Amino acid sequence: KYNPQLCKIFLAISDLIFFNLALWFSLGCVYFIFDQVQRFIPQDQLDTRVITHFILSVVCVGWFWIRLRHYTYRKPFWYELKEIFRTIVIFAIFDLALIAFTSRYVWVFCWTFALILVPFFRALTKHLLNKLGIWKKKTIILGSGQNARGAYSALQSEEMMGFDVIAFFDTDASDAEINMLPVIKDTEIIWDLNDVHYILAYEYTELEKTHFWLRELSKHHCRSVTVVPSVMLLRIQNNLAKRSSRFLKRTFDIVCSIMILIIASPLMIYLWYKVTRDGGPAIYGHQRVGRHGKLFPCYKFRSMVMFIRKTSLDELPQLFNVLKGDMSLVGPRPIVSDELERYCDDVDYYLMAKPGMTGLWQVSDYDTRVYFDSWYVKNWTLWNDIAILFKTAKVVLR
Amino acid sequence: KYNPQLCKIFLAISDLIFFNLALWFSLGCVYFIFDQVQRFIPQDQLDTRVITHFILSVVCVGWFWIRLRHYTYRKPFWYELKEIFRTIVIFAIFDLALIAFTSRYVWVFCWTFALILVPFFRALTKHLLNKLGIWKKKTIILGSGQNARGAYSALQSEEMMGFDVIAFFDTDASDAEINMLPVIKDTEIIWDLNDVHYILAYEYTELEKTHFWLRELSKHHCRSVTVVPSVMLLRIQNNLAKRSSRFLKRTFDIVCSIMILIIASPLMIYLWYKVTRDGGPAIYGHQRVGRHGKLFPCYKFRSMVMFIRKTSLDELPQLFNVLKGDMSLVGPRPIVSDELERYCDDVDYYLMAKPGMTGLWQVSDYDTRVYFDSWYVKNWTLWNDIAILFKTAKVVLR
């Protein structure tokens, strides 16, 4: 039932309408709290101002349609969110330049509103549109090994893109069921299926096959093609080796930890009162390996004798720890010194960054955790920290 | 004697000074031809306007320093030049918008001046620094096969980059001289050399070695690293399959052919008068394979009985061909139908695009020409057309 043009039209309508609604909400709040905007913006400005905003609005959708191509190619939720935030803050810079060259409060209100609402309302409209069933588009995976099934699992890791993997294909598939999906070996089925999207996930040793398929989908002019690997210049950015990144992470850690301490102090104090009925220290320090291999006392709610565990509140006192600098909010899970050997050659990756209360594996065996922590350390960004923190809050809620 | 800090400082100073000098030149020309700018821009504007320009200027260098990194990483002259034009035209949108919310002639004059002068004067500055010996930085190549020597030759293809290859390295090198350069097999020489840049050019079958070297340059913290190959998403853009690109190429071809006709009509008419002394057609049509395999009469100056060839003027009448659509300026060299077989599986690539007066191989055996033409067809851009046309004019001059 997949329908691309209706999706694009609805998404553009949502973008324009809600981008205008941000400024209208700013106007309404200013009127409700101050009662006079003619005080602030005289009347003859309005139309002029608003039409300028209209122009900006269409420019925004233009930058999202013909340059960033949000309406023809699909990205995960978080990459979309980061790109949209960068675009909209750059647009806020544009409008600040326009206004300064001609109010701060109305500008801040409108654009904070926009940042909050445009992605959330895009999510709402795409969810309703998925409920309408023209969002999910049918896809065929090529490959019958671990790479294909892992990519399939990655696709189900976030349904909001709408890739419905309907069937697999591999001329030499050992099984008939991959992840309980039908397997196609005679390619005539594939070509008779032609709005069918394709995902190439052949393994490295079969990469040559992909090259053949790289030609195949070109011959019948199939534009919906995507390949996921198992004179070019790739710059691997070791972000954790930058002093500016470390200082920014320290500042963000301090601010967020202080804020959440302010938020959750009553609950922690109530837990203190309830636990201290036995007469002992409700908070204990356990030795763990931290940054550079440094041994630190992690502070935790006491769980044993001289409900919290199910709710996972026992990790709350670590914020005091974060107040001193031993760990961040986002990072590898703390482990004992005996568990260090299981990292093997990745030990250096485990010791390069401060540990975190939450990490990639917490929200996504021991080797899987080690690989996820190493990937987080190698590809650390502040955006990744925000995403992992939001996912951790989501997990806590569910 | 290589010096990065002096080069960066000089390049920034040149960029800023000449960006301001563009506006000063616009002011001077407007004054010389009009005699009154107070007519146009009153006096109290000047300082305000100029300081805004000053701000824009530093913004420009900022956008070239911390975002585009033109001062720490080296790019080919044409990629640099295209990126600089894109930056300047985006800034043109900026400044035209800034003026709109508050003259067309002065703005156009000033920033055509900037567009012409900033790249050319930056080139003059880096050539002067090359004469001063702080531009060429010493580089070590890794690899002893065809890929290493090919990357070496492609590096000498643009000496303005500033990469002086001083020695090779390969533990298993068969020879002692690669391109007559010294070869190292004990890496202790390389680590004793440590401002030494590195170029990894190991072949695909030895790619594993590069991975080891990928670690090696990491452990000694050598940040001057570069690799040239012999979940990622690579979108191969077949530009020639786009109707908009084809129409743009048609319009550009028409305009450029018309202007070349306007410029070169006296020379062509004179050569007509000189050749027609024998009483025959100075212009002849030779059958050649064109777009889609279409056979077309290519127009050429007559060279045989019933100086021009040395000067290569005999290819001038093909402009008339370009006027009808069988020829472009930039494209594969026209060949006879017997030469088609030598393209082999690449024949389809030879037939997809209109033949041009000049091509990539003309300015850069038969197989090399076929590969260059196929690469041009696959990776065609209007910027590539401009670069090849400029290189062809350069070749004609030399």
From Swiss-Prot, chains A, B:
Recorded metabolic or biological pathway in which this protein acts: Bacterial outer membrane biogenesis; LPS O-antigen biosynthesis
Main location (coarse class): membrane
One GO molecular-function entry: phosphotransferase activity, for other substituted phosphate groups
UniProt keywords, alphabetically: Cell inner membrane, Cell membrane, Lipopolysaccharide biosynthesis, Membrane, Transferase, Transmembrane, Transmembrane helix
GO cellular component: plasma membrane
UniProt subcellular location: Cell inner membrane
Membrane topology designation: Multi-pass membrane protein
Alphabetized PANTHER family for the sequence: COLANIC BIOSYNTHESIS UDP-GLUCOSE LIPID CARRIER TRANSFERASE, UNDECAPRENYL-PHOSPHATE GALACTOSE PHOSPHOTRANSFERASE
Descriptive protein name: Undecaprenyl-phosphate galactose phosphotransferase
Gene it is expressed from: rfbP
